[PDB]
Write an enzyme that holds these catalytic residues in place. Structure first.
Site, short mmCIF file in Angstrom:
data_model
loop_
_atom_site.label_atom_id
_atom_site.label_comp_id
_atom_site.label_asym_id
_atom_site.label_seq_id
_atom_site.Cartn_x
_atom_site.Cartn_y
_atom_site.Cartn_z
N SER A 187 30.56 21.33 44.98
CA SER A 187 31.85 20.72 45.29
C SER A 187 31.77 19.20 45.30
N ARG A 194 34.21 17.47 46.38
CA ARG A 194 34.93 17.10 47.58
C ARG A 194 33.96 16.91 48.74
N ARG A 247 31.58 32.47 22.67
CA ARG A 247 30.83 31.23 22.86
C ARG A 247 29.59 31.11 21.99
N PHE A 294 34.51 28.62 32.84
CA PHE A 294 35.28 29.17 33.94
C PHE A 294 36.59 29.83 33.50
N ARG A 295 36.96 29.73 32.21
CA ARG A 295 38.11 30.47 31.69
C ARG A 295 37.81 31.98 31.60
N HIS A 296 36.51 32.38 31.67
CA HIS A 296 36.15 33.79 31.65
C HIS A 296 36.37 34.34 33.06
N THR A 336 32.90 50.59 28.52
CA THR A 336 32.80 50.73 29.97
C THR A 336 31.38 51.07 30.50
C1 LIG Z 1 39.85 24.87 50.61
C2 LIG Z 1 39.09 25.52 49.48
C3 LIG Z 1 37.78 25.18 49.27
C4 LIG Z 1 37.05 25.75 48.25
C5 LIG Z 1 37.66 26.71 47.41
C6 LIG Z 1 38.98 27.10 47.64
C7 LIG Z 1 39.70 26.54 48.66
C8 LIG Z 1 41.13 26.96 48.89
N1 LIG Z 1 36.91 27.25 46.32
C9 LIG Z 1 37.56 28.17 45.36
C10 LIG Z 1 37.47 29.63 45.82
O1 LIG Z 1 36.09 29.99 46.00
C11 LIG Z 1 38.16 30.60 44.86
O2 LIG Z 1 37.48 30.57 43.61
C12 LIG Z 1 39.65 30.37 44.60
O3 LIG Z 1 40.29 30.06 45.84
C13 LIG Z 1 40.33 31.56 43.97
O4 LIG Z 1 40.61 32.45 45.09
P1 LIG Z 1 40.65 34.02 44.89
O5 LIG Z 1 39.32 34.50 44.42
O6 LIG Z 1 41.21 34.56 46.16
O7 LIG Z 1 41.74 34.17 43.72
P2 LIG Z 1 41.69 34.98 42.34
O8 LIG Z 1 42.97 34.77 41.61
O9 LIG Z 1 40.40 34.68 41.63
O10 LIG Z 1 41.64 36.48 42.88
C14 LIG Z 1 42.79 36.99 43.60
C15 LIG Z 1 42.32 38.13 44.47
O11 LIG Z 1 41.77 39.17 43.63
C16 LIG Z 1 40.52 39.59 44.13
N2 LIG Z 1 39.48 39.24 43.16
C17 LIG Z 1 39.67 38.61 41.96
N3 LIG Z 1 38.57 38.56 41.24
C18 LIG Z 1 37.62 39.24 41.99
C19 LIG Z 1 36.28 39.57 41.75
N4 LIG Z 1 35.61 39.20 40.66
N5 LIG Z 1 35.62 40.26 42.71
C20 LIG Z 1 36.29 40.58 43.83
N6 LIG Z 1 37.56 40.36 44.15
C21 LIG Z 1 38.18 39.69 43.17
C22 LIG Z 1 40.40 39.06 45.56
O12 LIG Z 1 41.04 39.95 46.45
C23 LIG Z 1 41.19 37.76 45.44
O13 LIG Z 1 41.71 37.29 46.67
C24 LIG Z 1 35.59 26.86 46.12
N7 LIG Z 1 34.87 27.35 45.06
C25 LIG Z 1 33.57 26.98 44.83
O14 LIG Z 1 32.96 27.45 43.89
N8 LIG Z 1 33.03 26.04 45.66
C26 LIG Z 1 33.69 25.46 46.73
O15 LIG Z 1 33.10 24.64 47.43
C27 LIG Z 1 35.00 25.89 46.99
N9 LIG Z 1 35.75 25.36 48.00
C1 LIG Z 2 39.29 58.57 23.81
C2 LIG Z 2 38.84 58.07 25.15
C3 LIG Z 2 37.85 58.73 25.83
C4 LIG Z 2 37.44 58.31 27.09
C5 LIG Z 2 38.04 57.18 27.67
C6 LIG Z 2 39.03 56.48 26.97
C7 LIG Z 2 39.43 56.90 25.73
C8 LIG Z 2 40.51 56.15 25.00
N1 LIG Z 2 37.62 56.78 28.97
C9 LIG Z 2 38.34 55.69 29.68
C10 LIG Z 2 37.66 54.35 29.49
O1 LIG Z 2 36.34 54.44 30.07
C11 LIG Z 2 38.45 53.19 30.13
O2 LIG Z 2 38.42 53.35 31.55
C12 LIG Z 2 39.91 53.01 29.71
O3 LIG Z 2 40.06 53.29 28.32
C13 LIG Z 2 40.43 51.62 29.99
O4 LIG Z 2 39.87 50.74 28.98
P1 LIG Z 2 39.68 49.19 29.32
O5 LIG Z 2 38.54 49.08 30.27
O6 LIG Z 2 39.63 48.43 28.04
O7 LIG Z 2 41.07 48.89 30.08
P2 LIG Z 2 41.48 47.94 31.31
O8 LIG Z 2 42.97 47.75 31.33
O9 LIG Z 2 40.80 48.44 32.55
O10 LIG Z 2 40.80 46.56 30.89
C14 LIG Z 2 41.35 45.78 29.80
C15 LIG Z 2 40.26 44.88 29.30
O11 LIG Z 2 39.77 44.07 30.40
C16 LIG Z 2 38.36 44.03 30.41
N2 LIG Z 2 37.87 44.55 31.69
C17 LIG Z 2 38.66 44.94 32.75
N3 LIG Z 2 37.96 45.16 33.85
C18 LIG Z 2 36.65 44.84 33.50
C19 LIG Z 2 35.45 44.83 34.24
N4 LIG Z 2 35.35 45.20 35.51
N5 LIG Z 2 34.33 44.44 33.59
C20 LIG Z 2 34.42 44.08 32.30
N6 LIG Z 2 35.49 44.05 31.52
C21 LIG Z 2 36.60 44.42 32.19
C22 LIG Z 2 37.87 44.69 29.12
O12 LIG Z 2 37.72 43.72 28.10
C23 LIG Z 2 39.02 45.63 28.79
O13 LIG Z 2 39.14 45.94 27.40
C24 LIG Z 2 36.60 57.46 29.62
N7 LIG Z 2 36.20 57.09 30.89
C25 LIG Z 2 35.27 57.80 31.59
O14 LIG Z 2 34.92 57.42 32.69
N8 LIG Z 2 34.77 58.92 31.00
C26 LIG Z 2 35.15 59.40 29.75
O15 LIG Z 2 34.63 60.43 29.31
C27 LIG Z 2 36.09 58.65 29.05
N9 LIG Z 2 36.50 59.02 27.80
O1 LIG Z 3 39.16 22.63 47.41
C1 LIG Z 3 38.45 23.10 46.52
C2 LIG Z 3 37.07 22.78 46.29
C3 LIG Z 3 36.43 23.36 45.26
N1 LIG Z 3 37.02 24.31 44.45
C4 LIG Z 3 36.33 24.82 43.25
C5 LIG Z 3 36.84 24.17 41.95
C6 LIG Z 3 35.58 23.88 41.15
O2 LIG Z 3 35.25 25.01 40.36
C7 LIG Z 3 34.52 23.69 42.24
C8 LIG Z 3 34.32 22.26 42.68
O3 LIG Z 3 35.60 21.62 42.87
P1 LIG Z 3 35.66 20.16 43.54
O4 LIG Z 3 35.25 20.35 44.99
O5 LIG Z 3 34.70 19.30 42.75
O6 LIG Z 3 37.10 19.70 43.40
O7 LIG Z 3 34.95 24.51 43.35
C9 LIG Z 3 38.35 24.66 44.62
O8 LIG Z 3 38.93 25.45 43.88
N2 LIG Z 3 38.99 24.03 45.66
#
Ligand SMILES: Cc1cc2c(cc1C)N(C[C@H](O)[C@H](O)[C@H](O)COP(=O)(O)OP(=O)(O)OC[C@H]1O[C@@H](n3cnc4c(N)ncnc43)[C@H](O)[C@@H]1O)c1[nH]c(=O)[nH]c(=O)c1N2
Ligand SMILES: Cc1cc2c(cc1C)N(C[C@H](O)[C@H](O)[C@H](O)COP(=O)(O)OP(=O)(O)OC[C@H]1O[C@@H](n3cnc4c(N)ncnc43)[C@H](O)[C@@H]1O)c1[nH]c(=O)[nH]c(=O)c1N2
Ligand SMILES: O=c1ccn([C@H]2C[C@H](O)[C@@H](COP(=O)(O)O)O2)c(=O)[nH]1
Ligand SMILES: Cc1cc2c(cc1C)N(C[C@H](O)[C@H](O)[C@H](O)COP(=O)(O)OP(=O)(O)OC[C@H]1O[C@@H](n3cnc4c(N)ncnc43)[C@H](O)[C@@H]1O)c1[nH]c(=O)[nH]c(=O)c1N2
Ligand SMILES: Cc1cc2c(cc1C)N(C[C@H](O)[C@H](O)[C@H](O)COP(=O)(O)OP(=O)(O)OC[C@H]1O[C@@H](n3cnc4c(N)ncnc43)[C@H](O)[C@@H]1O)c1[nH]c(=O)[nH]c(=O)c1N2
Ligand SMILES: O=c1ccn([C@H]2C[C@H](O)[C@@H](COP(=O)(O)O)O2)c(=O)[nH]1
Ligand SMILES: O=c1ccn([C@H]2C[C@H](O)[C@@H](COP(=O)(O)O)O2)c(=O)[nH]1
Ligand SMILES: O=c1ccn([C@H]2C[C@H](O)[C@@H](COP(=O)(O)O)O2)c(=O)[nH]1
Lengths: 220, 220, 213, 220
Positions: free
Chosen positions: D89, D91, D175, D78-80, D56
């Site tokens: 885009s 589109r 990767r 993008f799977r990450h 963390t």
């Molecule tokens: C019509 C249209 C057009 C486009 C696009 C979508 C649509 C519907 N997109 C895709 C868009 O940017 C987005 O990646 C997807 O709609 C996924 O939406 P969410 O992030 O809301 O879902 P997702 O499932 O990723 O997250 C769900 C919710 O969790 C929160 N969230 C998740 N991950 C977060 C994070 N890392 N930080 C903060 N909040 C987080 C938010 O509240 C979010 O609404 C796009 N993309 C693009 O790259 N280029 C483009 O031109 C377009 N165009």
């Molecule tokens: C023995 C011990 C001791 C401590 C702590 C834990 C334990 C087990 N912690 C808590 C620790 O910092 C952490 O918040 C929890 O163990 C949750 O771990 P994950 O982030 O793996 O779980 P979580 O369920 O949040 O995430 C699951 C997995 O998703 C990923 N992940 C989720 N969100 C992410 C993000 N935003 N960015 C990147 N990867 C993300 C990681 O791969 C993670 O393993 C802590 N905390 C603290 O603040 N001070 C302390 O002193 C301690 N001490």
């Molecule tokens: O309607 C849209 C347009 C874009 N994208 C995201 C998907 C791809 O990661 C990238 C480009 O998609 P295309 O516009 O080429 O379909 O932006 C969407 O999710 N929805």
């Protein structure tokens, strides 16, 4: 609905589950344009995924638990972000007289200047005084959200926890381990038992190849 | 990027530690869709407003903040529910905790008809935290491990943490916490977060208030 | 069993579900009329977290350009067919002439359908040739067009599914993914009628679900 | 901005960064109510965190990259999910004649019935035909979002990637490894170089204690 009692008044209860070992198998096999095959090959696939770190197929098994735990345990638990939570509110609920009082056995292995029984008493005394002050403030018109700030970290809370098997396995690696606080290790042991009952192949393979903690390999 | 700092409550604070990007980070990320980059202040500020009123939120995820917050544990419990962020907090298992608690001022009870004066509520709260903290030190001095001794400490104990969050999740935090439905104590911290956000991203903050902000206190 | 055919060769199939409308009630509360009223209250005031306790698993067959837009929804679980390890089938999305009717084209829509089919045929033939000649699958597939069909498992909770519906069951989304979102909405309505009805009533941001039954 | 060319026309470019090795030190030290100390102790702490799986604190270092890659590589990238993306885009943009044509050397180690040079030609031929068809559909009034569906998986796309060091290290484990497709290994090597340049202590400790892949220990 399996229910396991933890500590003096806490518990872990299974509320619902989606899928089983075959859910992970079906999800892994789509990579090869395949589905299920047979028990021996499917169980072998589970072991293969666990041995090589193919974790995403396990995200398709989901659990919902109902947990009653002290707030210091819930604060460590709620750090697991990859999950869903819904908990009792101290702003809106009148809190119950339910606190975690450690037994004298909790201090075994520690040389203490006062007997462990006296530590148990001192802890009980402070929670009694704090709870009485809380009720006094409530009865005097102090809003609940302010009156509860005097309540100690051993106050019991209740929450619903929805988590997939991948995040649950991360929870077990970190919490079913001697580095985690003893109180949460007990909760993680209960989570492990429910996990083993619902996903025997995944649990067995997890212990065998991917489990990073130490207590699950020693405790049955 | 330098160290902004706002004092909250009697002993708490919100301090800006670091920032990545600004309004133009969201502009550059939105424009890649059309194979474009930056243009000019009028068109780029107009784009920020367009994104905000149309719900195109992902470009704002490229602006990131790191805060250093000192807050009572009941505030931190509400805050740590925001999962889409990074946290690192002070550990009561390993640190000997300082005598730092949130004591509400008599003014916190304004608008509540209380049977005892607000000044006496302040005193009762101070008294119970004094007793709990003294018991905590006694258990520590007697050899009780810190992780057990701290369980008698009340929910108003101050804790410290680092919070790394992007502008999209920060705006969700402001909608929920910079609002009269949130507890008064966490609204105070959310006002400090909004103040820093406004300073670092003026166009995003202004557009957010104008078209997407769901809370009520920032508009007042 | 619930399976809905989408486009020319795709589908949305429900594989599993955890919970129902009462799962969101059991999560919020920590009677039919009072529970529906609570669901409506949660949706109206933006209390979304209780809806995360309802989870769905779908089996979807879709063209890669649709899956690329779909896989942008990070708050979900995916497992998809691999072009690196599988010999891909001759399955591509060929738009019908009706997909282009509404646009003034210099060539008939039927001819556009033919041109698209022709280029996918040439690409697929090249792909098989490279495979037969010993070219590893992961390299040979790079000539295959974006309309190639893929298959995936999608595990998603009702909160993230509702976000998916706001964005994809909307005229701004590409027509092809709107069709998949309509099928997702149908299954979601069947399994969580109260949540879907309350969502349409108070929180749904899109436009097509209020017009299409 | 650090820019590394990958494949025939792709690249990885560092756009912005928040924090450095000391950001992780600072976040880890709050556990003990401490901050920074000195270079030797702070670098030793980074190694300690990596050796014992304390991940963390590394989430407080954030990077923004600008990447140009073929769509088959972007699909794997993008799977990450624990990251932010904004991509070009198809589109809305008229796509350029930019495709990944593998060199004959890409087929070394594989017994092919036709020379690798002929495979390169066959790939180039089919992209030429597909791109020409795409332009003809565009010129005939076919909306871009449909016309692009004939374009092959080696079409170049561009995107912004905002990711923290913890998720970036997960990306490198998966990767920057021989099991990943060669094309994305080339991008992961460039990500590793920029990571090493900005966080030398974290990168060195990662390779030494936590890195699960194989190619970063062989390639400088
Ligand atoms: C019509 C249209 C057009 C486009 C696009 C979508 C649509 C519907 N997109 C895709 C868009 O940017 C987005 O990646 C997807 O709609 C996924 O939406 P969410 O992030 O809301 O879902 P997702 O499932 O990723 O997250 C769900 C919710 O969790 C929160 N969230 C998740 N991950 C977060 C994070 N890392 N930080 C903060 N909040 C987080 C938010 O509240 C979010 O609404 C796009 N993309 C693009 O790259 N280029 C483009 O031109 C377009 N165009
Ligand atoms: C023995 C011990 C001791 C401590 C702590 C834990 C334990 C087990 N912690 C808590 C620790 O910092 C952490 O918040 C929890 O163990 C949750 O771990 P994950 O982030 O793996 O779980 P979580 O369920 O949040 O995430 C699951 C997995 O998703 C990923 N992940 C989720 N969100 C992410 C993000 N935003 N960015 C990147 N990867 C993300 C990681 O791969 C993670 O393993 C802590 N905390 C603290 O603040 N001070 C302390 O002193 C301690 N001490
Ligand atoms: O309607 C849209 C347009 C874009 N994208 C995201 C998907 C791809 O990661 C990238 C480009 O998609 P295309 O516009 O080429 O379909 O932006 C969407 O999710 N929805
Ligand atoms: C006034 C008031 C009152 C209450 C509460 C909040 C407030 C403001 N809460 C807390 C509330 O349920 C919630 O946990 C926090 O407001 C965090 O909100 P997000 O989930 O939006 O933040 P978070 O940062 O976790 O998520 C940000 C965004 O990401 C998405 N998201 C993240 N994780 C997701 C997931 N797993 N699935 C789907 N989408 C996900 C959503 O789009 C969300 O808006 C509560 N809590 C409680 O337990 N009991 C209570 O009584 C109350 N009461
Ligand atoms: C060599 C090789 C081969 C393949 C694949 C990868 C690699 C490296 N994949 C892709 C793989 O299934 C996965 O989608 C990506 O590697 C992303 O990995 P993470 O989930 O670790 O990253 P991501 O950035 O999404 O998450 C980072 C970390 O957060 C946690 N996490 C995030 N979201 C979570 C959630 N919802 N539940 C639980 N934990 C969560 C985990 O701890 C995870 O390691 C795959 N895929 C496929 O479908 N078919 C295939 O055939 C292959 N083949
Ligand atoms: O305004 C609120 C009320 C509750 N909660 C969350 C935090 C805890 O996980 C739980 C109970 O908090 P309290 O109501 O006891 O503060 O619900 C919040 O985040 N904000
Ligand atoms: O074993 C531990 C120690 C700490 N933390 C988290 C929970 C709190 O957010 C913070 C401090 O916890 P305590 O050490 O005070 O229990 O760090 C854990 O999750 N597990
Ligand atoms: O090495 C791999 C193989 C697959 N996948 C993911 C990306 C796609 O979502 C799906 C199929 O990818 P291909 O094997 O077709 O490249 O699985 C990866 O991320 N990396």
């Amino acid at each position: 609905h399996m229910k396991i009692d933890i500590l003096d008044k806490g518990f872990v209860e299974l509320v619902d589950v989606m899928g089983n070992d075959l859910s992970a198998v079906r999800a892994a096999r789509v990579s090869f344009d395949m589905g299920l095959k047979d028990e021996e090959r499917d169980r072998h696939l589970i072991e293969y995924l666990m041995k090589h770190g193919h974790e995403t197929p396990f995200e398709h098994i989901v659990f919902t638990f109902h947990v009653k735990a002290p707030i210091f345990v819930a604060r460590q638990w709620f750090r697991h972000r990859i999950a869903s939570y819904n908990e009792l509110s101290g702003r809106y609920s009148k809190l119950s007289y339910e606190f975690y009082i450690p037994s004298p056995e909790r201090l075994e292995g520690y040389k203490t200047t006062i007997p462990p029984e006296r530590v148990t008493e001192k802890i009980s005394e402070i929670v009694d005084k704090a709870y009485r002050t809380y009720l006094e403030l409530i009865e005097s018109g102090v809003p609940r959200e302010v009156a509860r700030i005097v309540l100690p970290l051993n106050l019991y809370t209740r929450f619903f926890w929805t988590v997939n098997a991948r995040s649950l396995m991360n929870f077990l690696n970190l919490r079913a381990d001697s580095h985690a606080q003893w109180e949460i290790q007990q909760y993680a042991l209960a989570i492990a038992r429910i996990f083993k009952e619902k996903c025997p192949w995944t649990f067995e393979a997890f212990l065998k190849y991917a489990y990073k903690g130490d207590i699950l390999k020693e405790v049955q």
